[PDB]
């Protein structure tokens, strides 16, 4: 019933590990379909070969800008941006997958994986999934980031797709 997608992560081309995500399509369906479809690449464009452009140790890893590769772009499968579906789920801990945005109703394709409890984000970013397998791969990724987000090595989504 709820889809599961994976990401094979790479640090400058060396394979690092697989993170897999359960998308809560039963509560945030339109948000979950957009991450699912961008992971499969079935609509022609997507995450494969994009990188995490902003990694802040102890906060979150952000990625998903496949058009401009630096947080200023990305687009959804419904057009460039769409509404905040709802705020049922909250940022309760590491592994929560939440939507990045540029204020309300500006969701595109950027997402962030929390590596800590970030309750201040509640009510401001739609949560739509959580890490299933691979959280120590997300944790190891932190080491390649910095206080301001700049990463030291290129961290890419080498491959991604749907598992179930």
């Amino acid at each position: 019933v709820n889809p599961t997608v994976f990401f094979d992560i790479a640090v400058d081309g060396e394979p690092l590990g697989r993170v897999s995500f359960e998308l809560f399509a039963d509560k945030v369906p339109k948000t979950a379909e957009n991450f699912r479809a961008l992971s499969t690449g079935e609509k022609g464009f997507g995450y494969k070969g994009s990188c995490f452009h902003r990694i802040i140790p102890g906060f979150m890893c952000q990625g998903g800008d496949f058009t401009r590769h630096n947080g200023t772009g990305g687009k959804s499968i419904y057009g460039e941006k769409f509404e905040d579906e709802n705020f049922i789920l909250k940022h309760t801990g590491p592994g929560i997958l939440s939507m990045a945005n540029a204020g309300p109703n500006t969701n595109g394709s950027q997402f962030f994986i929390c590596t800590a409890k970030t309750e201040w984000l509640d009510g401001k970013h739609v949560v739509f999934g959580k890490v299933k397998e691979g959280m120590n791969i997300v944790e190891a990724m932190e080491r390649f980031g910095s206080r301001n987000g700049k990463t030291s090595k290129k961290i890419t989504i080498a491959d991604c797709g749907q598992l179930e």
């Binding site: 079935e42 609509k43 022609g44």
Partner: protein
């Protein structure tokens, strides 16, 4: 167009002459009215870019509309190439090179390459993108064919209310400026331009009146 098999896989299939005949006949008989976009989207479900270029080149007459559609497709392809630059160098063995705008259009690529794009893992929907572009072009074409503007509608002293509302909603569906603007128009302009007798019969029901009572008021 691709078609699934018994075991679930799909492979290219030659375009049926019946589809082309029906498309050309509906284009000739129904000209360019709002009801060609749904039939176009229904006729060519899963059609390759070659099949869409066939269905467009086969339309004899109305060459100005086809040139407008070609220009719109060209602009969309240019914007797609600008927003998605293609990479150079050797391509991976398990991946086929991504198409450019002129190749998304299907102008400079073979049919086998379209089939490989459409049946790849993951599949690449070139047919759906080019169909969206053609639908946008057809929307612009049906906008151009619109005979009169929305504001110039005024009912004659003898023209029945049924014909008035028919013409109104016809040119309204042909306008397609927006949805909320259309909702405001059907509230204001619909009752603003009625014949004085039936006009005051409609005003007797107030703005809360719906279309059904709006019509059965002037009816009989």
């Amino acid at each position: 167009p691709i078609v699934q098999n018994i075991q679930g896989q799909m492979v290219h299939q030659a375009i049926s002459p019946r589809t082309l005949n029906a498309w050309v006949k509906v284009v000739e008989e129904k000209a360019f009215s709002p009801e060609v976009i749904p039939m176009f989207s229904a006729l060519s479900e899963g059609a390759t870019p070659q099949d869409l270029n066939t269905m467009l080149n086969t339309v004899g007459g109305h060459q100005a509309a086809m040139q407008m559609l070609k220009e719109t497709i060209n602009e969309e392809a240019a914007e797609w190439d600008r927003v998605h630059p293609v990479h150079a160098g050797p391509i991976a063995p398990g991946q086929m090179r991504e198409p450019r705008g002129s190749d998304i259009a299907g102008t400079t690529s073979t049919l086998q390459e379209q089939i490989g794009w459409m049946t790849n893992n993951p599949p690449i929907p070139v047919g759906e993108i080019y169909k969206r572009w053609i639908i946008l072009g057809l929307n612009k074409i049906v906008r151009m064919y619109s005979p009169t503007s929305i504001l110039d509608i005024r009912q004659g002293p003898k023209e029945p209310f049924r014909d008035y509302v028919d013409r109104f909603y016809k040119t309204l569906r042909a306008e397609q400026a927006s949805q909320e603007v259309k909702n405001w128009m059907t509230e204001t302009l619909l009752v603003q331009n009625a014949n004085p007798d039936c006009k005051t019969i409609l005003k007797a029901l107030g703005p809360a009146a719906t279309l059904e009572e709006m019509m059965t008021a002037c009816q009989g």
